[PDB]
């Protein structure tokens, strides 16, 4: 079998990305935010907190006859950004982009933090990191994929997103039109969770490459691109009147500057991000200071390739025995 299903900026600024998920008999449309970073399938649903329901479309297993409590079992998670639901747990029945699995755990939450009901585009969360961190107790549970793997043409996913732009999620097949030149693939350690692999090293602008090591994770959950201090200073460096701002929370830049690209390396292989890509506008309203796309990792404990990276490429997410990563240019 194999899925195919279309991936959606939220906003203007491709704060995130929402993909429409059915779930339960008849089916029920949610859009999802799709996040290789987390492996938690949750929902807004009848059983949320009214106060803390804003728009969102909600889950109700009471009118899916596919539905069953899965008695006892409760979930609660923390994201990077603070950001937190909790709640219940059912099974049903879920497809994406035509592709079923039967029996998925279904995470009904009773609670979200505020970051969640602002955002009345987001229905919930459909996590693809590895099944070891989902948050289900006391019978962990596994992500949609590795419920779908064995049925799959191939036990893989790919993740093709747009710059301010629809884009794709493919799974079980690689879209050979999809991408240019070939993929290189690169090793992960699944030994935290995460798609978790190490960049060759990185270019600002026209400049030479430096060759360095920088281990971080493949993350379509995370907005932005948080590298080292030592990287993030050197992008900056090369923006006139950029500097970190403690009272905005990172980079900012005038945004009457042109950006310079970034390139990071896979292997021998180069993905060039274009400057565009790091801009995400005024900080307020109005501002002429704008907010960089390109951040320090420094206090997260771990660098994070988010959207701004992974949107400048065609990435393979190989759920083989040894899982890979490949990147490829588009
Ligand atoms: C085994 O789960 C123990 C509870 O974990 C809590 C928890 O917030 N975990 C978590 C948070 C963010 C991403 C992710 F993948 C996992």
Same mark, same amino acid.
């Given at each position: 079998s194999t899925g195919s299903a279309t991936t959606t900026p939220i906003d203007s600024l491709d704060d995130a990305y929402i993909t429409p998920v059915q779930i339960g008999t008849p089916?029920?449309?949610?859009?999802?935010?799709?996040?290789?970073?987390?492996?938690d399938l949750w929902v807004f649903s009848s059983e949320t907190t009214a106060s803390e329901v804003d728009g969102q479309t909600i889950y109700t297993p009471s009118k899916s006859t596919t539905a069953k409590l899965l008695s006892g079992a409760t979930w609660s998670i923390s994201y990077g950004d603070g950001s937190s639901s909790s709640g219940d747990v059912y099974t049903d029945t879920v497809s994406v982009g035509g592709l079923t699995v039967t029996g998925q755990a279904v995470e009904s939450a009773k609670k979200v933090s505020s970051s969640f009901t602002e955002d009345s585009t987001i229905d919930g969360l459909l996590g693809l990191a590895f099944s070891t961190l989902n948050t289900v107790?006391?019978?962990?549970?596994?992500?949609?994929?590795?419920?779908?793997?064995?049925?799959?043409?191939?036990?893989?996913?790919?993740?093709?997103?747009?710059?301010?732009?629809?884009?794709?999620?493919?799974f079980g097949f690689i879209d050979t039109t999809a991408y240019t030149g070939s993929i290189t693939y690169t090793a992960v350690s699944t030994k935290q969770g995460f798609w978790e692999w190490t960049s060759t090293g990185y270019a600002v602008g026209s400049g030479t490459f430096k060759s360095t090591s920088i281990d971080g994770i493949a993350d379509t959950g995370t907005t932005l691109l948080? #590298?080292? %201090?030592?990287? $993030?200073?050197?992008?900056? =460096?090369?923006?006139?009147?950029?500097?970190?701002? &403690?009272?905005?929370?990172?980079?900012v830049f005038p945004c009457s500057a042109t950006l310079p690209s970034f390139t990071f390396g896979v292997g021998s292989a180069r993905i060039v991000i274009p400057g565009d890509y790091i801009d995400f506008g005024p900080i307020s309203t109005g501002s002429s200071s704008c907010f960089g796309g390109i951040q320090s990792s420094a206090?997260?404990?771990?660098?994070?390739?988010?959207?701004?990276? #992974?949107? %400048?490429?065609? $990435?393979?997410?190989?759920? =083989?025995?040894?899982?890979?990563?490949?990147?490829? &240019?588009?």
């Open positions: 089916a029920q449309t949610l859009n999802l935010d799709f996040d290789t970073g987390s492996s107790s006391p019978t962990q549970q596994k992500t949609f994929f590795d419920n779908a793997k064995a049925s799959l043409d191939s036990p893989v996913f790919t993740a093709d997103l747009g710059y301010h732009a629809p884009g794709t999620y493919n948080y #590298l080292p %201090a030592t990287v $993030v200073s050197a992008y900056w =460096a090369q923006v006139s009147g950029a500097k970190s701002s &403690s009272s905005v929370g990172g980079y206090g997260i404990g771990i660098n994070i390739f988010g959207d701004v990276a #992974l949107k %400048a490429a065609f $990435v393979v997410f190989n759920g =083989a025995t040894t899982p890979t990563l490949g990147f490829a &240019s588009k």
